[PDB]
Structure formats: structure tokens, C-alpha cells
Symmetry: C5
Subunit: 205 residues, 5 copies
């Protein structure tokens, strides 16, 4: 519609997607969770697991809010993620780049809350030497911001999901746990948070 077209024009004006949208030394809170959809393969020689994981991220960007009565009918909009600031979140265990399977779009509502929910095909490093035993292999998937400390980007955790796991693969899911942490690194004065998912699985008999 015409109201949407006018809204998109205003949202991009004076907006720099390279600048994290903090406000007066108050961090941007980013909620992060993961749904393991499939274990595609396990390479026992090279110590590699191949997965499809659906990442779910959300945060508030105060530059993206609008008055609902100025734009009647427009409750939320669909925007390419390249036009917004997004978290620079990395899988620390990754040995190749991710392949993104979903359209690179985010949903933004009228108070500036953004949802970006990419599904990714990803290969990563793990010791899979007990994968073909009763107590299987257990792998850690550590996620965190690459360039923003706790006072800039407050990474927070949400409930993990196993309901979407594909039943017909040759691996079964024994368990999934999760834990937020915070550490000081040698480089830097400020601490950096992370969210780590621990996945235990094994080959089907």
C-alpha cells in the first residue's frame, strides 16, 4: 500500500546499518535460541558434524519505531536484513561458512522490535568418537558476538526446541541442554557473553 511505501522511505532516511543501536550507554538486548532440525551426516575420520539449525534472534532498534495512527493499518513490515543493523553472531566451532536456506528478510513491528530467523546448513568440529555407542557423542555449539562486549550487546537466552527434529535420519537425539556464560579474554577490558548448546546424539542400531 501507499502507507507502507511512505513508511519504508522514512525508516531508511538517516539510518546507518553499521552502527549498533545503543542508547545512552544502555546495551542492545538480543534474545537468541536454536532449533536443531536435522543431523545430515557425521564424518568420523575428520571429526565433523553436518547439521541444519534454525536460529531465532530478536532485539529492539529504537530508530525503527513509528506512530501507528500516522500509518493506519501498518502493524509490521517485511524488510531485507541488509538494510538493518544485525547481530554479528558467530558459531565458534565452525570450519566452513554457513549456507543460508531462508529468504534474508526480517519482521519489524511499530515499537521497533525486530525478528530475524535464519535457517542454516552448517558443518562444524566435534569429537564424534562415541557416536556409535549407547551413550553417544556430545558436541558443544558455542555462539557469541564477534566485536561487541556485554555493555554494548547483552546476549540473552531462550528455550531450545527439539519438536522440529526430523524422525527419519540415521541419528537419534539423546539430549539437548543450554547455558549462558560470560568471560574475560586477554585482549580486552570488557567481558564477552555467549550462549552454548550441548547436543548428545547417536547412530541408530
Amino acid at each position: 500500500g501507499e502507507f507502507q511505501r511512505k513508511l519504508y522511505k522514512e525508516l531508511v532516511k538517516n539510518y546507518n546499518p553499521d552502527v549498533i543501536p545503543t542508547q545512552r550507554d544502555r546495551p542492545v538486548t538480543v534474545y537468541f535460541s536454536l532449533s536443531l532440525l536435522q543431523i545430515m551426516d557425521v564424518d568420523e575420520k575428520n571429526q565433523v558434524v553436518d547439521v541444519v539449525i534454525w536460529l531465532q534472534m530478536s532485539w529492539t532498534d529504537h530508530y525503527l519505531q513509528w506512530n501507528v495512527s500516522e500509518y493506519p493499518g501498518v502493524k509490521q513490515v517485511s524488510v531485507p536484513i541488509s538494510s538493518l543493523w544485525k547481530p554479528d553472531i558467530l558459531l565458534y566451532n565452525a570450519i566452513e561458512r554457513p549456507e543460508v536456506l531462508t529468504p534474508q528478510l526480517a519482521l519489524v513491528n511499530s515499537s521497533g522490535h525486530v525478528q530475524y530467523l535464519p535457517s542454516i546448513r552448517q558443518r562444524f568440529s566435534c569429537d564424534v568418537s562415541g557416536v556409535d555407542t549407547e551413550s553417544g557423542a556430545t558436541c558443544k555449539l558455542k555462539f557469541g558476538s564477534w566485536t561487541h562486549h556485554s555493555r554494548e550487546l547483552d546476549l540473552q537466552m531462550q528455550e531450545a526446541d527439539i519438536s522440529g527434529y526430523i524422525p527419519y535420519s540415521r541419528f537419534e537425539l539423546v539430549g539437548v541442554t543450554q547455558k549462558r556464560s560470560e568471560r574475560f579474554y586477554e585482549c580486552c577490558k570488557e567481558p564477552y557473553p555467549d550462549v552454548t548448546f550441548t547436543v548428545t546424539f547417536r547412530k541408530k542400531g
Copy 2:
């Protein structure tokens, strides 16, 4: 011609391809169908099917209409899809990104009706454990919009085609059925439609 060159210049003016062309809370109807052209391979270990499928989409964009007597001779135009809004339709079963085999162009007529008909090479997840039996393996291919609900994008179905199936592959087509659906999801207020194709096939001999 000169009239075409002037028309393209007007069509792009004040046009944002990121904004779905709804008008006064009336959704954009999108007709969707599929023609299975080939089954290239079946990976029985990893539970993957490799296909070429020809997707057929059409819809009306009211911003792309023109007066026929202002542009005499110009009944329709060939336009790169990147310059238009297009449906953000996703194959939910996909485990890699699609490879598009056709030129990325759409046809638009004078009342703003768009046709975009991409042929794609695609690999996806399915239980193929009865592929080498009499009754065969049966796979679901679920398609739907990633960011637009029913009141924005009204996805509608059309008749599937088996006539283009390649006769000389090592798999034969036992059947194809189709079904539109509509559900409420936990996330969201508004319902989401989808179009699902069920394909049954088996190995020859």
C-alpha cells in the same frame, strides 16, 4: 522501441521492490503451481532427493499498469525480476539453496499482471526408504511465504502438470497430488497459508 523505453522509465519511478503491493487492506493474490521435470538422483543413506522443478507464479501489481493509448503497440514487457516485488516463497523441506536455471525475467501486461516462471535445480529432505519397492517412496514438498500472512499474501493453487516429466530417468512417477492449507502458528496473530505437493515415485526394474 521509443515507447517501451519511456514506459520502463515511468514504471521504476517511485517504485520500491521491497514493499508488497497491497491496496487498502486487500491482499495480493498469488497463483502457484509446479511441474516436476526430472528426478536426478536419490541418496538412500542421507535421505535426500535431487529434482528439477518448474515453478509457475502469477499475481497483479497495481503500480505496474499503464494506459494502452499512451504507449501504442506496447501490450506487455520483459523486466528483470530484481526490479519488481516478488513473492518470498520457500520450500520448507530444502537442505541447500536453489540453483535457478532460467533467465531471471518476468512478463508484465498493461493491467499490471505479472508472470514469473523460474525452473530450479533443488535438493531436499525426504524418507526414501521404500523407493525400491512396488508402492514406492512418497515425499511432501511444502511451499509458502516466509514473511507474509494471509491478509497480505493470499496464496492460491493451480493444476499440477506431469506432462513434462522426462521418460528416460532411472525413476518413474507413480503419482502427484496437491492441497492448499491454512494454519495459525504459536508465534503470530495472523494465519499462514501453504501449498503442498505430494510426489510418489520408485526405481525402475
Copy 3:
């Protein structure tokens, strides 16, 4: 030179590469031919042939002509194909995208005649059962425009070449024929032309 630099500046001015350069309801004639340079491989299980083919296309674009005495010395220019309109010609049998081996440049002379001669590495679908016999496998390579009918784009044929075929591959060339055709499709009012190359070949063992 200085005259060339001035000419390139004028050629791009008021030029839209998305608009086919028809003139007063007279189609653009496009001459098309093919030289088979190599048969790299044949996949008997999956019914795929791997080739290098040199495509040769030429046409007249009336917007690219210049007065020879305004630009003395300048008989023809070398221009990136991305800055011109080009035919949207497709190999209908293709199962992957082409890999272009040559620089993406075209030659344009002073009366606007364009030559664009890409060499491509291409895999396509064919029944190759019979490849290891005396009479060999016979494959059709069908080429045509994706979005332009006969009254917009008049596809014409030229003499096929076998002189560039590499003698040291493990496949030998039994024969090559070619045929222009024109058909009505279900979609459309206007007929669409094509040029099809029929290649018969066999294993040397």
C-alpha cells in the same frame, strides 16, 4: 584514444539495457550458431552429458550506431555485455547453470551491429544408453528466447562447425545436424522460435 572515450560516454547516455531494441513493430533478428569444442564426460547412471560449446550470436541494435566522420578512426569498440541489451537465450535441456569461460565483452561496429561469442562449460540431460555401441547416443540441444516471441525476436540459424572438436577425448563425433522451428505453446498467443542441434556420438572403446 580521445574519440573512443567520447563515444563510450554517448553510447551509454539514455540507454536502457533491459529494453529489446525493436523499431516500429519490426523484430530484432538474432543470428545463432554453435561450435562443439569438447565432450568432457558422459554419466551413464544419471543421464548427463558434459560439454564445452562456443555459442556465436549477432544482432543489430539501432541505438548503438554512430557517424564515422564525427569519430574519425573509430570503426568498432569493445564493450562489456552487461552495459548492452542481450538475447535471453536458454538451453532447454540444461540441469545446471552455465560456466562462462571467456571475457564478458562484445564487439560493436559503427552501424550498431553487435557480436557476442561466449564459450561455455555446460552439463545437460540426455539419454546416453547406446553411447557404447556402433550407432551411438543421439542428443538434442534446444536453444530459444525465454521471454520474447517471433514478432519481437526473430531467431535465425547459421552453419554449425565441427572443425574445433578436440581429437584426443574418449568420445568421437558420428554426426551433427540442425533445424530451426516455430511452435505455439499453451501459455501464449504468439509463437516462439527455436534452434535445435542434434549431436550423435560414441565411445572410442
Copy 4:
């Protein structure tokens, strides 16, 4: 914040990322180090090693400094590396391009000191003929600027790290040493520095 947004706008103004930020017979000093995170594979037939290495680079760019009291609260910023000048450092032994695993971002503080710390997946040439012996295979990894001599770009060395080496691969790390050098080449009047890492490793069992 608002001060950050204003700062980014000023940093890009009159800034050319193609120009090395020397001033008047001072070179740009670039500190370089490496942390070997994993040996993924060794191809004994083709003489190739496959690694993940974390490169650590830092330098001062005097065009990126700002007055701290003009931008209160803003001590450092996160910037895409493509918008800055960066060292043109090359692995001389490389037989494919690198695959970058981390976000392409750098940290810049108020006096213009830049940190850029890419983790890369890289394959390179080495004689691995004693890899399955007690004393192991020993490989040289030579790094240096491609276009800048010593008086433009002063490459300096820092302490190598083995603490991040993954314990569960099928190769073990016998040792890592490092050495800065400087040589005259036939081409050029000015000498060129390099930093070379020598890595000795062997197969387990």
C-alpha cells in the same frame, strides 16, 4: 547512539581505503601473528595441507582518530573492513583462495589503532612425505605484503600461540617456530619483509 552515528559519518568523509596511510617517511607498522587452531587433512599424493588458522593483525591509521570529548562515551567502534585500508598480506604457499569464517569487521579506538582478526580455512603446498614417522613433516608458511616495500609497510612479528590447537584431530603438533626476514628481489630497488611460521606435525599412532 547519536554520537556513534555522527562519528561514522565523519570517519568516511574524505577517506580513500585504497591509499596506505603513510606520512612523510614514516612507514605503517603492522603487527602480525598466527594461532594454529586445527589441521583438518593432509593429502600425501598431491602434497597439500588443510588448516584453520586465526590471523591477528593490527596497525595505526592516523585518518581514523577522533577527539574523545567531541564524542563522549565513544571509546571504540566496530567497522566493516571493506571501508578501511587493510594490509595486502598473502600466504605465498597457498594453492586456493582462503575461506573467511569470521564476520569481516575490525575494531578501531580513538587514536586510530585498528585490530582485524580473521579466522581462515586454507589449503597450501608442502612436502608431507615424513608425516607418518617419529620426526614428522615440517612445513613453512610464508606471509608478506604483495605490493608494499619495507619503507611503506613495516611488517613486525608477535608471539605465536599453540593453546587453541584442537586436541581430538588425527594429527599432533610437534612444534611451531617463527622468524621475521627481509630480502631484496630482482624486480625492485627496495627490500620486502616477511614473517614465516614453521610447523612440525605428525599422524597419531
Copy 5:
């Protein structure tokens, strides 16, 4: 420095990288040579050789010259090749696109002489049927401009080098010759030069 920043700004002004820098019907002379650095593999079934080759090209572009006393201290500059005109030189035997291993930068001195020295990973077609014999397989590598004839681009030859050949591969170098030539092709009125390298090699006992 400040003089460099001013120089880069002037060099790009009124510069079109698509226009070969001839001057009053006098061709651009391009010196071309090759250093074979490695033979990575030989595929005997498909008739393919896999190499790393270091190409060395240089030429004069009269638009890139500057007065040395206007820019004191600035003898040469490091510039991205994408901002300059470069030779459109092709390996005629290539069956895949090249992978460029070096930074895409060129050196330009004050009288406008450009040096561009890309190292490339390349696969090409050759009859390797005597590779495992005493006299070896002999392959021709033919290089030439794709769109410029002799009167536009004067391709000249320089001394080949085998000093960079890697000693630890499983193939050894029997012989290398080189030869400049000039031929008429069917397309065109004007003759086209080429530089061909003949490499004889064999498997090690």
C-alpha cells in the same frame, strides 16, 4: 600520505576502465610472460592438467602519468586492477574459469607504466596419454586477447622462468619452449597475435 591521496583523486577523474588506452592509431604494447610454479594433478581419463601459473603482464597507460615535482616523494602507487583498463587475455585451452590467488592490485609508476602479476590456479585440456613414459606428455598453453587485434593491442613476449617450479611434486619438467605468432581468424579483417607456451613433463619413477 597527502600527496598520494591527491594523486589517486586525479588519476580516476575522467577515466573509463572499459577503453583501451591507444593514442592516435598507435597500439598499446603488452609484455607477457609465464612462470610455471606447480603441476598439482593430471587426470588421465578426462585429459585435464591442473596447474598453478604466475602470469606477468605490463604496459603503458598514458592517462596514468604524473609530474614528479607536483607529487614529491611519490614514485609509484598500488591501485586495484578493477579501476584500470587491463588486457582481456584468455587461455584458449581452459575448461574452467581461473581462481586468482593474489590480491587484485597493480603497481603504476610516474610515466604511466603498469605492472599486474596475478598468480592463478587453472585446469585445462591436454592429451596426457604419454605422461607415464620417458619422453612424457607435451601440452600447449595458448594466450591471447579476446577482443583486440594487432593494431590495437601489440602482444609481445618475454623470457619464461622455471626457477620457481616446486621440486617436491610427483611430476618433473622435461622441456619448455615459447613462441609468439600472428594469424587471421574467420571472424575478422585484422590479424590477432598470441603467445604459446609448450610444456613437456612426466611422472616421476
